[PDB]
Design a protein around this nucleic acid. Structure first.
Ligand SMILES: [Mg+2]
Ligand SMILES: [Mg+2]
Ligand SMILES: [Mg+2]
Ligand SMILES: [Mg+2]
Ligand SMILES: [Mg+2]
Ligand SMILES: [Mg+2]
Ligand SMILES: [Mg+2]
Ligand SMILES: [Mg+2]
Ligand SMILES: [Mg+2]
Ligand SMILES: [Mg+2]
Ligand SMILES: [Mg+2]
Ligand SMILES: [Mg+2]
Ligand SMILES: [Mg+2]
Ligand SMILES: [Mg+2]
Ligand SMILES: [Mg+2]
Ligand SMILES: [Mg+2]
Ligand SMILES: [Mg+2]
Ligand SMILES: [Mg+2]
Ligand SMILES: [Mg+2]
Ligand SMILES: [Mg+2]
Ligand SMILES: [Mg+2]
Ligand SMILES: [Mg+2]
Ligand SMILES: [Mg+2]
Ligand SMILES: [Mg+2]
Ligand SMILES: [Mg+2]
Ligand SMILES: [Mg+2]
Ligand SMILES: [Mg+2]
Ligand SMILES: [Mg+2]
Ligand SMILES: [Mg+2]
Ligand SMILES: [Mg+2]
Ligand SMILES: [Mg+2]
Ligand SMILES: [Mg+2]
Ligand SMILES: [Mg+2]
Ligand SMILES: [Mg+2]
Ligand SMILES: [Mg+2]
Ligand SMILES: [Mg+2]
Ligand SMILES: [Mg+2]
Ligand SMILES: [Mg+2]
Ligand SMILES: [Mg+2]
Ligand SMILES: [Mg+2]
Ligand SMILES: [Mg+2]
Ligand SMILES: [Mg+2]
Ligand SMILES: [Mg+2]
Ligand SMILES: [Mg+2]
Ligand SMILES: [Mg+2]
Ligand SMILES: [Mg+2]
Ligand SMILES: [Mg+2]
Ligand SMILES: [Mg+2]
Ligand SMILES: [Mg+2]
Ligand SMILES: [Mg+2]
Ligand SMILES: [Mg+2]
Ligand SMILES: [Mg+2]
Ligand SMILES: [Mg+2]
Ligand SMILES: [Mg+2]
Ligand SMILES: [Mg+2]
Ligand SMILES: [Mg+2]
Ligand SMILES: [Mg+2]
Ligand SMILES: [Mg+2]
Ligand SMILES: [Mg+2]
Ligand SMILES: [Mg+2]
Ligand SMILES: [Mg+2]
Ligand SMILES: [Mg+2]
Ligand SMILES: [Mg+2]
Ligand SMILES: [Mg+2]
Ligand SMILES: [Mg+2]
Ligand SMILES: [Mg+2]
Ligand SMILES: [Mg+2]
Ligand SMILES: [Mg+2]
Ligand SMILES: [Mg+2]
Ligand SMILES: [Mg+2]
Ligand SMILES: [Mg+2]
Ligand SMILES: [Mg+2]
Ligand SMILES: [Mg+2]
Ligand SMILES: [Mg+2]
Ligand SMILES: [Mg+2]
Ligand SMILES: [Mg+2]
Ligand SMILES: [Mg+2]
Ligand SMILES: [Mg+2]
Ligand SMILES: [Zn+2]
Lengths: 99, 104, 83, 208
RNA sequence: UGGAGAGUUUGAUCCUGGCUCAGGGUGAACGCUGGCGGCGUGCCUAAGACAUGCAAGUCGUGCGGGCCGCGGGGUUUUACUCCGUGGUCAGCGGCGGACGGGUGAGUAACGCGUGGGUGACCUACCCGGAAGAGGGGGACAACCCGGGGAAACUCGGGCUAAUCCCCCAUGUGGACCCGCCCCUUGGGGUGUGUCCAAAGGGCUUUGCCCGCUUCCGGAUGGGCCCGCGUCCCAUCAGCUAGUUGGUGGGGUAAUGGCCCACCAAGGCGACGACGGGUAGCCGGUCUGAGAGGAUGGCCGGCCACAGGGGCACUGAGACACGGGCCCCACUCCUACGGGAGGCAGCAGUUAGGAAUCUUCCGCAAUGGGCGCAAGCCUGACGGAGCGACGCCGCUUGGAGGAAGAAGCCCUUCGGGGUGUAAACUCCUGAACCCGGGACGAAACCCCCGACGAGGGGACUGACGGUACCGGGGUAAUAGCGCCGGCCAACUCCGUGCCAGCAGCCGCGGUAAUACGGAGGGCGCGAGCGUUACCCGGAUUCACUGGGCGUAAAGGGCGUGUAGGCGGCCUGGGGCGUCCCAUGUGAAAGACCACGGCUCAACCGUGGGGGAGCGUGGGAUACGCUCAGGCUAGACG
RNA sequence: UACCUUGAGGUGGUA
RNA sequence: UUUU
C-alpha cells in the first residue's frame, strides 16, 4: 500500500481551500458593487468595482481563475455597473470605467 | 468553406427562426437511378426577414442554439408555395396512415 | 513537446529504426508526425543511415528535441556541422 | 521429408521413365524397361478410360514427381509462376529448373536429383563462393554453382565430374569440369527443356 | 491478365427448383500421429471472483528539520555552544502521476469515417522575438508538547524555511468598459479611465549555467460545430416539455435548452420519427472474374470503460485504472463503535468452457518521467519459456543392387503382387562432441576547442557462450485420410436389412470394389483427418445478373394521394452529368522492383495506382430548372 | 430361439 | 402383405 501521492491529495486540499477563499471575495465584492450601482451610489459603487477588478486579475495571476475567465468577470461587472448607473449615476471616481 | 445550401422556407411559426426544406439529388450507390432526398434546416432569421415560400440560401454558422446552426445568407426568389404545398400535403398525407389511413 | 527519435520497425533480432518527428507522448511505434530518415544499427547494407538534413533542420528550428541517439545519428549525417 | 521409398514404382504408375536414379535408369533395368505396367496387384489388367480429372492429376504428378518437390512447395512455385508476368506454364518450368538441387543435377555434379539434393544439404556445394545447403535455393542468372574445395577430393565427386568430361550440357548452362564449377547462364527457355510433361494440363489441374 | 463445374425428382425426356460436393480462409478446437529451427501467434466463454510479488516516480543545484556517526572551534576545565562533514527517514516545495499498459462492457451516436468550419476556443514542457525581476510582510508541515481510537487514523497547543502565500512598486506589455477607424459574427488598430507581473538557486564567482515574470508568435496536442456515409424488425407509426424557438442571465477556454427565469407554441416523422434487437468504428482482413458478400483477432488511428451508480476537487490538461467523496453489492479486519479493498497492468490462481502459456531474464537497445549531471524509476519495451496454433525452411539418407529372398496377398496352380523394396557393398553424414565466438553500442559523460561546430577519450550488453565459423563424427522419427458414383485408388475373407456405413445419391435381407479385416492402391507428409464458422460454386435476392398463362409468383375491380416516369422547336441558367488543375486520401497492409538474414517465411528501401470529398476554371449533348413556341399525346 | 414359406421379411402354421 |  502507501503510495506517496496522497501528498498530491493533501496539497489539492490546501489549494482547494485557497481558491475557494479567493473566489468568494470576488463574488462578494462584485455583488456589492452591482448593488451600490443599482442604487445610484456612483462614487463608491465604482470604488468597489475597482477592488473586484483587482481581485479578479489577481486571482488570474496563479491558477485560481486564470484565463479569459478573469476577463469575463471583469467584463460582465463593468457591463452591469455602467449600465445600472443609468439611473442618473454619472461616473465620479471613474475608478475603472473609461467614459 | 462554411457550407452553403438552398431551400424553401416551409415554416414561419418561430421567433427569429425559419425551417428551410433543402432538397438534394444523387445517384443510388447500387441502383444508379438518380434519387432525390431532402432535409429541413432551422436557420436563423434575426430580423424575421424571410417568409413562407422564399427560396433562400443557408450558410453554415456558429451555433445559435440547439437544433439551429445556419443563418439565412440571402433571398434567391420570393413567393412560391407550389413547393410549400408539396411539403404541406406530404405531411397531411401522414394524416392517418396509422391505425386508420391518411387522406387522398 | 515534439521530438526527433527512433521508431522500431525491423523484426525480432532484425531491428530497423526510423528517425522520426513525433509528439513525445505517443507510442514509440505509433502515429508519427513525419519520417525524416532511417537507420540500421547492424549496417547490414552500405546504406544503413539516411537523414534529410533539410527537414531535420526544419524541425530542430521549431522545438523538436532529439533523443541522444537520434541527436548522434543526426550529427553523423551532417545535421549540425557548420564549418 | 521428400518421399523416400520405392521410386522406380512412380516411374511405373506414371507409365514413363522418370530419372530418379541417374545410372541404372539407363541400364536394362529401370523396370520401365521391361515391366511397364503400374505397381500393385492390378497393374496388368486392362485400364479403364481415365477421367479428364485423372489425366491432369497424373500429369501434375509426373512433372512434380520429377523434381522430387513436395506438393506444398510445388504448389507455391506454381502460384508464384501464375502471379508473375509471362506465360505461366513456361515460367513455372523455369522456376523449377532454378532450384539449386536441380542445377547441381543439370551440371552433373550429381547423378540424380535426390543425390544432388543430399550434396547440397551436406554442404558440398557452393554458390558464388559461400556454400549453400538449401535444395530449394533459387539460382539467379550469372551465379557460379560449384563444389567446395574441401569436397573436390571425394570419390563420388570424382567419378561424377569425371564422367562429365567430354559430355555436353544444357545451353542455358556452362561447365568447367576441371574447375568443378559451372554457371547458370539463362532461365531455360521452354524449348530448351524436353520434359515428358504437357504443362498446359498442369495449369488446368490447378484451375479446377 | 480475368469467370470450369458435378451428384440427386423420371421407365425415359426437357424445364423449373431445393439439397449436396469439389476451392479458399480461421486467434480454433477434437482424434490418431509427432524430429529440428526461424518468424509470428495464443481466454473467442464469466466486463466473473481474485492469494502473492512487481507494474510511477524523481529532484539536496527550491527549503527547514529528526535520528545515528565522525572532525574542528569559543575555556584553565565544566556546563553550554559554533562550524564542517557521512549515513538515514520522511516533511514542505516542484515536475511527472491525464503518457505509457489493459479491456470492449456500454454506444446505432457527430461514436466512427470522409471533407470542411472555429470572427466561438484552450494547449504544461520545446523553439523564436520583446521586456523585466526594486521593497516589504505572512503562514503551515517537519520538529516539540498534550489528548482521543482496538484499528485506520485523529483533535488541540507552540516553533520554523523556501522557487510556499500575500501587500506595495516598476507597465515592455496585456486584460476590461466607453468612443472612433479598418475589418466583418467575438478579427485588427487606436484614445482616455481602471486593473495585472516575478524566485530564486549553482558555480570552472563581476560572469556563465539552471530557473522566475509579462507579452507576441511558432510547433505539437486538443475542445466545440457542420455536409455526407454507417446493421436487423413496420407483427414498433405516430413521438416530444427543456420539448422547438425567443429575450435576459448563469456556466466554460469556447458556441449551444448545456442550465435557469421569463415569453412564444413550437420541433420530429413513411426520404421511416418513436420503440425493440444486435453491435465499439476504421486503416484493413477473408472470399470473389468483378460487382459484391463476410469480418474488424494481431498491428496502427479514433472512441468508451476501470466492481455497479452518481460527484466534484487539484491541475495546462482528469471528472482522473494503480487520486478523493457518497450510495450499492461482495471480501477482509473488528474491543461491534468503526475501519480496509477493487489485476479490463505483467505473471499467476480459481470458476466457466471444446479451448488459450511463464508467479521467467534484462534495462544492454529503442522509448518515456524526473534530474545541470552522475543517475534513479520504467512487467512500456528488448529477449527467453511453454503450445505443430499458423507460415516458411530442413531431416528420417544418396548410388549400386535378382527376370527377382523370405513372409504376407492373389491364383485359370503355369504364375501374378508387395519389389530395387529389403538383405548386402560403397559414399555422404542430421544428431552429438572439441575449439573459437558476434553484430545489435555509441552516445550521455570527460578532455581540447567558446559547455557551439569539429576532434579526442572512457563506460556499457538480458538475449549468450546463443547465432555464425573451423575440426571431429553416427544410416539416424512416419504417420493420417481415403479407394460405389461425384472423386485419384480393387481384390480375397468375414458378416447376412445383422453388425454397421453414410457429405449428397445410397450400401447391408449368403458372390457386398459401399459393413469389419487383410493384401494391394490413390492422396498428402510432421502431419493428416474431424467438427464449427465465413466467402465461393449460387444469375439460388439476379446492380453487374432472375423472374410471375400451366413450375413459386398479377393485387377481385375501380377511383385516386404521395411518389416514379415525360411529346416537338428555341433561348437563359449550369443543379445532375462530363473535363482540366489543385488540395486531401497517415503508417502498416496489398501490388512492382531492388536489397538484408546461406533460402524462404520475416524484414528493409524505393516506385506506382487509387474511389470519395474540398477548391478554382471550363463544356452544354442528355437529365433538371426558368422563359417562349408548337400540335402528332391528352382533353373538349 | 428352430423348421414350414419367402429372395429376405411381416403375419400365420407346426414345439 | 414390408422391402428389391
Ligand atoms: Mg513528490
Ligand atoms: Mg503467369
Ligand atoms: Mg415427380
Ligand atoms: Mg430413378
Ligand atoms: Mg411419365
Ligand atoms: Mg440442380
Ligand atoms: Mg517462438
Ligand atoms: Mg510469446
Ligand atoms: Mg475477453
Ligand atoms: Mg477470467
Ligand atoms: Mg472484474
Ligand atoms: Mg540530514
Ligand atoms: Mg527525500
Ligand atoms: Mg463494445
Ligand atoms: Mg436502438
Ligand atoms: Mg463529421
Ligand atoms: Mg474530420
Ligand atoms: Mg480544431
Ligand atoms: Mg521562450
Ligand atoms: Mg497551530
Ligand atoms: Mg502599459
Ligand atoms: Mg506602452
Ligand atoms: Mg501591482
Ligand atoms: Mg510564486
Ligand atoms: Mg495550434
Ligand atoms: Mg431505431
Ligand atoms: Mg457489446
Ligand atoms: Mg458471384
Ligand atoms: Mg488495433
Ligand atoms: Mg465507475
Ligand atoms: Mg465505484
Ligand atoms: Mg501540472
Ligand atoms: Mg481548475
Ligand atoms: Mg489516475
Ligand atoms: Mg475517479
Ligand atoms: Mg474518464
Ligand atoms: Mg489495479
Ligand atoms: Mg493478469
Ligand atoms: Mg472445466
Ligand atoms: Mg532502459
Ligand atoms: Mg533512456
Ligand atoms: Mg520498483
Ligand atoms: Mg515483450
Ligand atoms: Mg516374393
Ligand atoms: Mg514372389
Ligand atoms: Mg536405396
Ligand atoms: Mg559497434
Ligand atoms: Mg547509461
Ligand atoms: Mg563536442
Ligand atoms: Mg476413380
Ligand atoms: Mg455393397
Ligand atoms: Mg461376401
Ligand atoms: Mg466409400
Ligand atoms: Mg472395406
Ligand atoms: Mg513443413
Ligand atoms: Mg456457401
Ligand atoms: Mg451471389
Ligand atoms: Mg437459398
Ligand atoms: Mg436485375
Ligand atoms: Mg428463377
Ligand atoms: Mg396447380
Ligand atoms: Mg401457380
Ligand atoms: Mg386480374
Ligand atoms: Mg390470385
Ligand atoms: Mg401524380
Ligand atoms: Mg423531356
Ligand atoms: Mg440551354
Ligand atoms: Mg435548356
Ligand atoms: Mg454544374
Ligand atoms: Mg483526387
Ligand atoms: Mg497508405
Ligand atoms: Mg536476398
Ligand atoms: Mg513500404
Ligand atoms: Mg468545381
Ligand atoms: Mg451555355
Ligand atoms: Mg412549354
Ligand atoms: Mg434371414
Ligand atoms: Mg428393406
Ligand atoms: Zn527408374
Amino acid at each position: 500500500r502507501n503510495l506517496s501521492a496522497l501528498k498530491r491529495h493533501r496539497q489539492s486540499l490546501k489549494r482547494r481551500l485557497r481558491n475557494k477563499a479567493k473566489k468568494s471575495a470576488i463574488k462578494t465584492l462584485s455583488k456589492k458593487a452591482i448593488q451600490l450601482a443599482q442604487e445610484g451610489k456612483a462614487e463608491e459603487a465604482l470604488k468597489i468595482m475597482r477592488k473586484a477588478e483587482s481581485l479578479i486579475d489577481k486571482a488570474a495571476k496563479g491558477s485560481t481563475l486564470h484565463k479569459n475567465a478573469a476577463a469575463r468577470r471583469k467584463s460582465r461587472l463593468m457591463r452591469k455597473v455602467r449600465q445600472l448607473l443609468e439611473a442618473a449615476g454619472a461616473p465620479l471616481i471613474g475608478g475603472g470605467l473609461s467614459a | 468553406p462554411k457550407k452553403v445550401l438552398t431551400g424553401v422556407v416551409v415554416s414561419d411559426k418561430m421567433q427569429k427562426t425559419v425551417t428551410v426544406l433543402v432538397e438534394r439529388q444523387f445517384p443510388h450507390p447500387l441502383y444508379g437511378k438518380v434519387i432525390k432526398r431532402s432535409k429541413k434546416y432551422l436557420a436563423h432569421d434575426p430580423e424575421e426577414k424571410y417568409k413562407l415560400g422564399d427560396v433562400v440560401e443557408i450558410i453554415e454558422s456558429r451555433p445559435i442554439s440547439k437544433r439551429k446552426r445556419f443563418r439565412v445568407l440571402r433571398l434567391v426568389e420570393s413567393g412560391r408555395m407550389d413547393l410549400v404545398e408539396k411539403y404541406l400535403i406530404r405531411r397531411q398525407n401522414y394524416q392517418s396512415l396509422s391505425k386508420r389511413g391518411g387522406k387522398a | 513537446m515534439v521530438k526527433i527519435r527512433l521508431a522500431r520497425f525491423g523484426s525480432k533480432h532484425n531491428p530497423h529504426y526510423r528517425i522520426v518527428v513525433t509528439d513525445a507522448r505517443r507510442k514509440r511505434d505509433g502515429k508519427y508526425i513525419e519520417k525524416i530518415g532511417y537507420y540500421d544499427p547492424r549496417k547490414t547494407t552500405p546504406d544503413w543511415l539516411k537523414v534529410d538534413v533539410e527537414r531535420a533542420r526544419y524541425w530542430l528550428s521549431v522545438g523538436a528535441q532529439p533523443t541522444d541517439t537520434a541527436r548522434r545519428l543526426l550529427r553523423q549525417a551532417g545535421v549540425f556541422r557548420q564549418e | 521429408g521428400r518421399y523416400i521409398g520405392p521410386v522406380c514404382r512412380l516411374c511405373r504408375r506414371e507409365g514413363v521413365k522418370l530419372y530418379l536414379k541417374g545410372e541404372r535408369c539407363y541400364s536394362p533395368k529401370c523396370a520401365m524397361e521391361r515391366r511397364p505396367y503400374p505397381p500393385g496387384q492390378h497393374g496388368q489388367k486392362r485400364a479403364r478410360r481415365p477421367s479428364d480429372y485423372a489425366v491432369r492429376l497424373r500429369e501434375k504428378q509426373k512433372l512434380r514427381r520429377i523434381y522430387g518437390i513436395s506438393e506444398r512447395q510445388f504448389r507455391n512455385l506454381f502460384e508464384e509462376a501464375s502471379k508473375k508476368k509471362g506465360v505461366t506454364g513456361s515460367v513455372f518450368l523455369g522456376l523449377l529448373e532454378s532450384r539449386l538441387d536441380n542445377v547441381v543435377y543439370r551440371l552433373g555434379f550429381a547423378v540424380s536429383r535426390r543425390q544432388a539434393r543430399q550434396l547440397v544439404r551436406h554442404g558440398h556445394i557452393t554458390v558464388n563462393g559461400r556454400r549453400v545447403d538449401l535444395p530449394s535455393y533459387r539460382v539467379r542468372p550469372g551465379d557460379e554453382i560449384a563444389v567446395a574445395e574441401k569436397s573436390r577430393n571425394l570419390e563420388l565427386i570424382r567419378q561424377n565430374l569425371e564422367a562429365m568430361k567430354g559430355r555436353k550440357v544444357g545451353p542455358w548452362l556452362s561447365l568447367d569440369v576441371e574447375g568443378m564449377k559451372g554457371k547458370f547462364l539463362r532461365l531455360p527457355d521452354r524449348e530448351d527443356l524436353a520434359l515428358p510433361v504437357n504443362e498446359q494440363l498442369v495449369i488446368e489441374f490447378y484451375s479446377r
